């Protein structure tokens, strides 16, 4: 569709940053200041769940300065924790690697709510269920 | 119901018939009952489109010949060897 520099997105661990392969060169190309972001990101990430991969969208200016919004962790990840599993099924739907109660999905839907378009909770719950079915994660009501 | 216009034939034989279908007018027949068989000359490029249906060979039809009535059905159907064209058509009276 469309893909240009400026306003980068990336999912980095809660309290960790600065490695070159994961970070560095990614936004580094854009003109971002690695160090500042590393310390800056992990600062707030302390309050935000530590140990939880959280996607952040950095937007740089002509100033080369930048800001970033920390949202909620990915649905797939949240489903993994909830399921208590480390990974997806490889062949989702064919083989189920884990399960999650309908209650849990509502909880994840609630967590992601801020980032989700869902008009009502059912809508949200079901956006996440869509991810679960893609993960080989069954849901028992 | 299906309505097919037509009229009696002038002649009936090789030359005659062959001359009708050669102008979109395959000669058909109508028999059954006490009424003497009827030899007409329907309009080809107008009946082949109507036979197009599956209804044609089930529900009776109304052939407007001369200006009278008849209410009949389709019996035998002679079609061209390879041309989608149609030919002699048998009509079972009521």
């Amino acid at each position: 569709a469309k893909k240009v520099q400026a306003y980068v997105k990336l999912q980095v661990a809660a309290g960790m940053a600065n490695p070159s392969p994961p970070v560095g060169p990614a936004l580094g190309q854009q003109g971002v200041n690695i160090m500042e972001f590393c310390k800056a990101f992990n600062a707030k990430t302390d309050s935000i769940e530590k140990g939880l991969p959280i996607p952040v969208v950095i937007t740089v200016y002509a100033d080369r300065s930048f800001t970033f919004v920390t949202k909620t962790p990915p649905a797939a990840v949240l489903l993994k924790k909830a399921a208590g599993i480390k990974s997806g099924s490889g062949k989702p739907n064919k083989d189920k690697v884990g399960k999650i109660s309908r209650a849990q999905l509502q909880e994840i839907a609630q967590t992601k709510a801020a980032d989700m378009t869902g008009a009502d909770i059912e809508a949200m719950t079901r956006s996440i269920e869509g991810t679960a079915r893609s993960m080989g994660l069954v849901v028992e009501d | 119901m299906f309505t097919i216009n037509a009229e009696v034939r002038k002649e009936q034989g090789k030359g005659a018939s062959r001359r009708l279908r050669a102008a979109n007018k395959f000669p058909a027949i109508i028999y059954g009952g006490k009424e003497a068989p009827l030899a007409i000359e329907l309009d080809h490029d107008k009946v082949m489109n109507m036979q197009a249906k599956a209804e044609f060979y089930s529900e009776v039809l109304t052939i407007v010949v001369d200006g009278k009535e008849i209410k009949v059905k389709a019996q035998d159907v002679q079609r061209h060897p390879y041309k989608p064209k149609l030919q002699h058509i048998d009509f079972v009276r009521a």
Binding site: - | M48, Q51, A52, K53, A54, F56, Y57, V77, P81, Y82
Partner: protein, 136 residues
């Protein structure tokens, strides 16, 4: 290699060779492929055509065959004139305009018929089907 004919007993022999007249019309499947115009439908021709129907398509339904060769077609080598009437070995069906294809399960009726029409020497229209209604 296929051979729709051969498979007869050995006697009765071969000979004659005439011209033709009018065609014929059959009916066995949901879709048929009829030819229009006399030509030589040799065994080899007929197998090539039919065999080309499945042609990595599907084994769905079942195809037919109304046409069937009648060998009696002699040829001679690099030899003298009328010293006998050398063997035949070749084939020939001698059609006019009959129907000879037919399809069981619908599927890709007309489609396939065309995907394999060139093998035949004569020209055959898309044709239609056993009917008492029509198409278009």
């Amino acid at each position: 290699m296929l051979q729709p004919k051969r498979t007869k007993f050995r006697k009765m022999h071969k000979g004659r060779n005439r011209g033709l007249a009018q065609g014929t019309d059959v009916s066995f499947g949901s879709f048929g492929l009829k030819a229009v115009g006399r030509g030589r439908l040799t065994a080899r021709q007929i197998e090539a055509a039919r065999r080309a129907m499945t042609r990595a398509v599907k084994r769905q339904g079942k195809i037919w065959i109304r046409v069937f060769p009648d060998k009696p077609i002699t040829e001679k080598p690099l030899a003298v004139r009328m010293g006998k009437g050398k063997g035949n070995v070749e084939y020939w069906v001698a059609l006019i305009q009959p129907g000879k294809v037919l399809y069981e399960m619908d599927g890709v009726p007309e489609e396939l018929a065309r995907e394999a029409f060139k093998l035949a020497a004569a020209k055959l229209p898309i044709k239609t089907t056993f009917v008492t209604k029509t198409v278009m």
